[PDB]
Design a protein around this nucleic acid. Structure first.
Ligand SMILES: Nc1nc2c(ncn2[C@H]2C[C@H](O)[C@@H](COP(=O)(O)OP(=O)(O)[C@H](Cl)P(=O)(O)O)O2)c(=O)[nH]1
Ligand SMILES: [Cl-]
Ligand SMILES: [Cl-]
Ligand SMILES: [Cl-]
Ligand SMILES: [Cl-]
Ligand SMILES: [Cl-]
Ligand SMILES: [Mg+2]
Ligand code: NA
Ligand code: NA
Ligand code: NA
Length: 326
DNA sequence: CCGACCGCGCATCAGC
DNA sequence: GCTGATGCGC
DNA sequence: GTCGG
């Protein structure tokens, strides 16, 4: 919040470029600037001072000077006044509606929550579930609720097969006092990079969680990734908890560290780290870290026994989860 | 200037 | 059906 | 929109 004004401004610009301009690189550019400024330990007094930071350039520095002088940005004022832009930006807040679908809907004259609700037949499944829980999905999850949810997921998985290990990742694993959703990494010894010795490993865990009415809806589901909806149980007479987004990722057991690195994030952290990897001649995904050959074709998986081995390969000091929140 | 910008799972579609 | 491209979301 | 080479 130290430079909250500026970071909010940059994020709104990022959002515009993603949702309206469908310009993903500008979106990332703005997001990177916002990240580096959020980290910066002084109240920025000028654009020039900000432009010192990597990711902040001439244009964002100009914008910062306007913001600091006036408390606002004319470019954003106009955007806010533009109906097409406002509408498109709104609709993308529904899970499953992205920039294109949003713009398509706005061409059909579907512009508001009302419109969506009276045109449910125009929505795919994910989008329908996103509309159903629109309000709920805007609420954050207090950590104390994540702890209750953790306890449920871990216990239920244990009942399915004691050899499963489920790890809560995302902002929770980074120590955040609230989270936008729950991310669960799962492993089981029978699923490795060498073999899938057992089918339905993810399905069985999903079934059990639906069985106990923890998972309530499914947005998408395959052999290794489940994306859906869950809800804590409430007590007699007590108002129900909001429905919450949940993602469960099943990773080969021997690839745990790359998997938990990926799923701990943050997303921007992962992008920065993978980019640095490339500069150092490696490529990192959720499975492996590999060298980039003479040509730039990935080579074979390097051995990894900890998260820190990954950092070591690319010549970064180890960062604890809590310091990966960029 | 001028690319290159992380990397990938699932849903859905077009074209064969 | 299949493969590939595109959208969306992590 | 920013930056490295
Ligand atoms: N490489 C990469 N990893 C990503 C990306 N997006 C997400 N991840 C990884 C990194 C990310 O941490 C994890 C879960 O994604 P979620 O969108 O839930 O991010 P949280 O951090 O949990 C977010 Cl602060 P909260 O859920 O609390 O509101 O997936 C991406 O674009 N790229
Ligand atoms: Cl772009
Ligand atoms: Cl503003
Ligand atoms: Cl690993
Ligand atoms: Cl791989
Ligand atoms: Cl930590
Ligand atoms: Mg999360
Ligand atoms: Na700069
Ligand atoms: Na959306
Ligand atoms: Na998530």
């Amino acid at each position: 919040t130290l430079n909250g004004g500026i970071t909010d401004m940059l994020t709104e610009l990022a959002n515009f470029e993603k949702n309206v301009s469908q310009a993903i690189h500008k979106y990332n550019a703005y997001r990177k600037a916002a990240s580096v400024i959020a980290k910066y330990p002084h109240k920025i007094k000028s654009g020039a001072e900000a432009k010192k930071l990597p990711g902040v350039g001439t244009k964002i520095a100009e914008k910062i000077d306007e913001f600091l002088a006036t408390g606002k940005l004319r470019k954003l004022e106009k955007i806010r006044q533009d109906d097409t832009s406002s509408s498109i930006n709104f609709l993308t807040r529904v899970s499953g509606i992205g920039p294109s679908a949003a713009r398509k809907f706005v061409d059909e004259g579907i512009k508001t929550l009302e419109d969506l609700r009276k045109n449910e037949d125009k929505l795919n499944h994910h989008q329908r579930i996103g509309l159903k829980y629109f309000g709920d999905f805007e609420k954050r999850i207090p950590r104390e609720e994540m702890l209750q949810m953790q306890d449920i997921v871990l216990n239920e998985v244990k009942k399915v097969d004691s050899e499963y290990i489920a790890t809560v990742c995302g902002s929770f694993r980074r120590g955040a006092e609230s989270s936008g959703d729950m991310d669960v990494l799962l492993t089981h010894p029978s699923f490795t990079s060498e073999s899938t010795k057992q089918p339905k490993l993810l399905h069985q865990v999903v079934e059990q969680l639906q069985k106990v009415h923890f998972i309530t809806d499914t947005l998408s589901k395959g052999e290794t990734k489940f994306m859906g909806v869950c809800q804590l149980p409430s007590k007699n007479d007590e108002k129900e908890y909001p429905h919450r987004r949940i993602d469960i990722r099943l990773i080969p057991k021997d690839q745990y560290y790359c998997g938990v690195l990926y799923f701990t994030g943050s997303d921007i952290f992962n992008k920065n780290m993978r980019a640095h990897a490339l500069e150092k001649g490696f490529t990192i995904n959720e499975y492996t870290i590999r060298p980039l050959g003479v040509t730039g074709v990935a080579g074979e998986p390097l051995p990894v026994d900890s998260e820190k081995d990954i950092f070591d390969y690319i010549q970064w000091k180890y960062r604890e989860p809590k310091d990966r929140s960029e």
